[PDB]
């Protein structure tokens, strides 16, 4: 139910459609697949680099998702690019927030290398120190009964942010953001009546999540400056954009 919609009988079509666009399975599959491929038959690997590899892949998938999004369709690339550039970091955390809670993703895994990958890092973007903060959010979210439905709406909310510098077709973005908020509100009201101010509780998180993303992007960029990771990646390009 957490990873599922609450009262499917009472859910809007829009939301159902949003949940359509998520294949959790593919995400986890893709994740371990890369991890296996990157590590089997290798004596040692740079764990930091690997995390980046995962993130790079995630980004591609992120882009793919947005692309097929109903709202993006009505958008020009320049505009889409700007939106994606703004919150890629933001989505990763939430996505991680989603898996950690909904799908029982663990903090670490044994690599078949005898090496251990900190999965948890993926959601901290390499800043270990944010774990308490990440956790605080995970707890807040759980108490709010964060569900699969909530998670998708929040993604759009994050993505479809009008107050983003340089976006030409502002109206469309505002409208979509505005719809989703409403849809989210409705869902909370109809399907989680018992949870008071759930809408606000969830909406309030986004700002918090963003703060985490910022630290994370900066660390990731700082690391790239040091020569720690490949420069040709989408991840770097994304990291680069705001500079």
């Amino acid at each position: 139910g957490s990873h599922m919609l609450e009262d499917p009988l009472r859910v809007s079509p829009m939301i159902r459609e949003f949940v359509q666009s998520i294949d959790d399975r593919e995400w986890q599959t893709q994740l371990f697949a890369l991890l296996q491929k990157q590590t089997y038959n290798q004596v040692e690997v740079d764990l930091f680099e690997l995390m980046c590899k995962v993130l790079d892949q995630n980004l591609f998938s992120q882009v793919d998702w947005a692309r097929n999004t109903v709202f993006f369709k009505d958008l020009k690339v320049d505009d889409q690019m700007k939106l994606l550039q703004h919150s890629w970091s933001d989505m990763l955390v939430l996505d991680h927030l989603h898996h950690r809670i909904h799908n029982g993703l663990p903090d670490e895994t044994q690599l078949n290398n005898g090496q251990v990958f900190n999965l948890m890092s993926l959601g901290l973007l390499g800043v270990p120190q944010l774990g308490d903060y990440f956790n605080e959010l995970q707890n807040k979210l759980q108490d709010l009964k964060f569900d699969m439905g909530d998670y998708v709406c929040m993604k759009f909310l994050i993505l479809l942010n009008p107050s983003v510098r340089g976006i030409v077709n502002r109206k469309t973005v505002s409208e979509g953001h505005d719809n989703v908020q409403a849809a989210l509100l409705d869902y909370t009201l109809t399907c989680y009546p018992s949870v008071n101010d759930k809408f606000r509780g969830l909406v309030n998180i986004l700002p918090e999540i963003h703060a985490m993303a910022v630290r994370g992007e900066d660390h990731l960029y700082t690391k790239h400056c040091a020569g720690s990771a490949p420069t040709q990646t989408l991840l770097m390009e994304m990291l680069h954009a705001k500079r």
Binding site: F60, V63, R67, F72, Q80, M81, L84, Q85, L234, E237
Partner: peptide, 9 residues
């Protein structure tokens, strides 16, 4: 440009 390529297609 890579970003653009992906969404440009």
């Amino acid at each position: 440009s890579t970003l653009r390529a992906l969404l440009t297609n």
